[PDB]
Amino acid sequence: PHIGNYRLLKTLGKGNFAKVKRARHILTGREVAIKIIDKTQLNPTSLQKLFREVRIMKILNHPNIIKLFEVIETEKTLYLIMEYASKGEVYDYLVEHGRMKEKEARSKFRQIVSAVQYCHQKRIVHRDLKAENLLLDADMNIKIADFGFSNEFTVGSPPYAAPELFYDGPEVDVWSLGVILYTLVSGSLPFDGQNLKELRERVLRGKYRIPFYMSTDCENLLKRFLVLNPIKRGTLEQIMKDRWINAGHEEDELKPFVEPELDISDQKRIDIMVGMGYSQEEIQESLSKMKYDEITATYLLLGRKSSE
Amino acid sequence: QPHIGNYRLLKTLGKGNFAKVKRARHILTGREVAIKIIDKTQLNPTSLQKLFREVRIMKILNHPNIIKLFEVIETEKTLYLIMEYASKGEVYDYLVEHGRMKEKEARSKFRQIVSAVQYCHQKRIVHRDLKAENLLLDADMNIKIADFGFSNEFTVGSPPYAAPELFYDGPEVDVWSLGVILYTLVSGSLPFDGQNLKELRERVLRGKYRIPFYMSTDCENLLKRFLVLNPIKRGTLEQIMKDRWINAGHEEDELKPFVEPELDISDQKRIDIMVGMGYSQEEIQESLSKMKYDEITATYLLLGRK
Ligand SMILES: CN1CCN(c2ccc(Nc3ncc4cc(C#N)c(=O)n(C5CCCC5)c4n3)cc2)CC1
Numbered sequence: 001p002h003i004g005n006y007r008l009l010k011t012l013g014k015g016n017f018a019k020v021k022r023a024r025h026i027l028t029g030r031e032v033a034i035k036i037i038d039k040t041q042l043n044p045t046s047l048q049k050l051f052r053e054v055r056i057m058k059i060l061n062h063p064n065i066i067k068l069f070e071v072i073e074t075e076k077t078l079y080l081i082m083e084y085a086s087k088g089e090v091y092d093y094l095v096e097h098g099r100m101k102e103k104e105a106r107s108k109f110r111q112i113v114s115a116v117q118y119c120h121q122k123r124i125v126h127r128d129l130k131a132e133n134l135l136l137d138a139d140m141n142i143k144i145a146d147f148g149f150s151n152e153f154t155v156g157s158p159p160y161a162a163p164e165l166f167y168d169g170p171e172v173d174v175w176s177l178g179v180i181l182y183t184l185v186s187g188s189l190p191f192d193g194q195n196l197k198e199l200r201e202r203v204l205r206g207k208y209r210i211p212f213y214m215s216t217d218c219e220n221l222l223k224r225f226l227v228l229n230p231i232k233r234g235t236l237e238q239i240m241k242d243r244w245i246n247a248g249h250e251e252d253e254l255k256p257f258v259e260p261e262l263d264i265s266d267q268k269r270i271d272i273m274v275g276m277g278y279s280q281e282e283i284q285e286s287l288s289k290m291k292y293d294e295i296t297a298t299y300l301l302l303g304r305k306s307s308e
Numbered sequence: 309q310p311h312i313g314n315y316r317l318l319k320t321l322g323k324g325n326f327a328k329v330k331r332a333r334h335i336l337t338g339r340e341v342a343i344k345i346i347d348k349t350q351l352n353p354t355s356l357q358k359l360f361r362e363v364r365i366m367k368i369l370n371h372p373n374i375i376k377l378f379e380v381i382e383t384e385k386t387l388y389l390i391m392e393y394a395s396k397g398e399v400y401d402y403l404v405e406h407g408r409m410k411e412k413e414a415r416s417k418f419r420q421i422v423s424a425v426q427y428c429h430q431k432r433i434v435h436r437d438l439k440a441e442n443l444l445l446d447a448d449m450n451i452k453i454a455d456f457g458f459s460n461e462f463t464v465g466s467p468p469y470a471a472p473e474l475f476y477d478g479p480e481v482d483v484w485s486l487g488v489i490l491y492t493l494v495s496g497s498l499p500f501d502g503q504n505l506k507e508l509r510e511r512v513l514r515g516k517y518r519i520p521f522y523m524s525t526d527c528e529n530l531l532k533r534f535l536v537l538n539p540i541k542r543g544t545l546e547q548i549m550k551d552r553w554i555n556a557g558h559e560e561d562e563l564k565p566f567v568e569p570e571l572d573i574s575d576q577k578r579i580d581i582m583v584g585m586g587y588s589q590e591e592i593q594e595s596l597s598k599m600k601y602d603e604i605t606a607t608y609l610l611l612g613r614k
């Protein structure tokens with residue numbers, strides 16, 4: 001089975017009003033993830049919120065945020081065609097290999113901090129960063145899923161939730177980032193329990209174990225995220241200057257991401273799409289207007305590696 | 309007249325929700341001020357924490373057209389916010405007394421308003437409830453906007469000024485209200501009104517308003533940049549600051565984002581006066597350097613005004 005130019009493959013997750021399937025673009029062979037939302041199960045209020053959030057997704061253009069390629073809408077269904085992170089959860093990588101060495105943890109956490117700060121600068125707060133939406137692509141780059149989407153439009157976390165949720169501003173992501181950092185360096189959650197009430201007591205206590213292998217610089221950095229009072233947490237713009245974050249990046253200090261200009265005049269890719277049956281003029285119109293249609297999707301997918 | 313801190317309390321200016329605002333006089337300098345009074349025992353631990361977050365925001369508002377905070381007094385039961393007093397009250401009262409502002413005067417005030425709001429937006433502070441009740445005028449007819457950064461329950465939203473999407477907390481909602489504000493300055497009337505809230509909402513959603521004979525096309529063009537139903541298509545304030553009508557008569561003085569003056573905390577003339585009032589030199593230097601918003605920094609600031 002298919003939708004538009006995509007062959008639908010196995011379901012990756014399901015829940016609430018959404019399903020996400022792996023899929024293969026027929027025109028290019030590139031793999032994608034497709035979120036399928038049955039609109040008949042939504043009231044007019046949820047429908048309006050969904051389309052506002054889709055418009056937010058169209059403005060996320062960061063190399064560590066799952067990228068939207070194409071939107072297909074029928075009378076009954078919304079299809080969101082987006083980047084597929086072929087290695088699944090960071091958690092799966094921690095299970096296989098153990099904790100990351102601090103050099104690898106730093107490389108991935110710089111990507112995560114960049115992605116989240118980039119959204120915060122645009123007034124977009126995740127509010128639900130967790131194991132299930134921290135993903136890795138085929139080249140071990142971080143890809144964060146579901147920025148900007150309300151939980152009912154995700155497939156579906158107490159260990160990561162800020163203690164003030166136990167508030168919807170950027171500080172709640174900063175707490176979750178501290179949990180993430182701790183999981184990267186130790187392979188363990190900083191706060192756990194035999195049930196939710198014990199988990200909550202430990203989160204409110206704010207204390208977590210520092211293993212012998214954790215550097216003092218990593219410990220000090222965690223203290224900037226895992227502060228109970230939300231207003232005393234560091235800002236990401238401040239944390240970007242942290243000594244641990246930039247160890248080994250002497251003249252490459254982490255700074256807010258700046259979007260490169262999108263090259264929409266690659267004639268090699270345009271030549272391929274003309275072969276596919278699109279006209280040069282049609283291609284230029286879709287790309288310059290960024291229509292999120294079958295043409296812009298194809299152009300972007302032709303820029304990725306084949307057969308994956 | 310009772311005292312709180314170094315202030316003599318005078319007439320009540322307003323009361324609503326969890327707040328009361330009184331006119332007062334600083335005993336030490338004789339300067340008039342406004343004091344917002346909030347009984348903390350009215351609040352839960354959650355709203356009390358939010359109140360303190362919004363006071364921390366108020367501390368960083370330093371714009372000549374934004375009501376300036378002078379002093380914070382917190383007791384076990386009550387929070388007192390001592391701030392600038394706008395002695396001529398609401399812009400509305402001026403419109404009632406003199407009618408619509410002529411174009412030059414409306415432009416002058418609207419530049420102040422746009423400057424104040426853009427200054428807050430750049431600091432990522434959205435008002436969300438700009439309205440007649442918090443657009444004020446000082447003794448020199450300068451705009452003073454009240455209650456930036458405060459939730460409604462801490463003030464003493466408003467259908468005629470509320471963006472149609474509230475019938476969202478980003479700057480776009482202020483931009484819509486600014487359009488309604490500009491219309492009131494130029495016409496003396498609200499653009500959207502009705503015999504009840506239902507009819508009023510209908511006109512906001514339609515987005516149509518009467519263009520009077522005295523409104524220029526440049527002014528009508530500017531209105532179209534605020535009063536857009538689609539929030540994403542509304543002008544941004546950085547863009548609106550370059551509008552032709554906004555800068556007419558200001559060709560070598562284009563409206564730009566406000567930049568705060570460098571703070572002067574070592575005026576020894578004012579410090580000398582405060583030593584005479586009984587504060588020590590060391591105390592004064594510490595209060596000013598740490599910007600404590602205590603009785604000392606407030607006196608320092610009030611000594612710098614008429
Ligand atoms: C032991 N593992 C094995 C499978 N494994 C997993 C495999 C691939 C991926 N990739 C991938 N790429 C893009 C995505 C976009 C989304 C959106 N919007 C989205 O929700 N998802 C997932 C996240 C929640 C479930 C659907 C996306 N997933 C994620 C996980 C996890 C368990």
Ligand SMILES: CN1CCN(c2ccc(Nc3ncc4cc(C#N)c(=O)n(C5CCCC5)c4n3)cc2)CC1
Nearest residue numbers: 321322329342344392393394397398441454455464
């Ligand atoms: C027919 N009129 C008669 C006069 N009258 C009026 C007179 C003076 C002023 N000034 C002034 N200066 C600072 C203020 C700080 C505030 C804070 N925070 C605050 O709330 N207020 C007001 C605004 C809402 C009621 C309290 C402030 N008001 C306002 C109005 C209006 C009616």
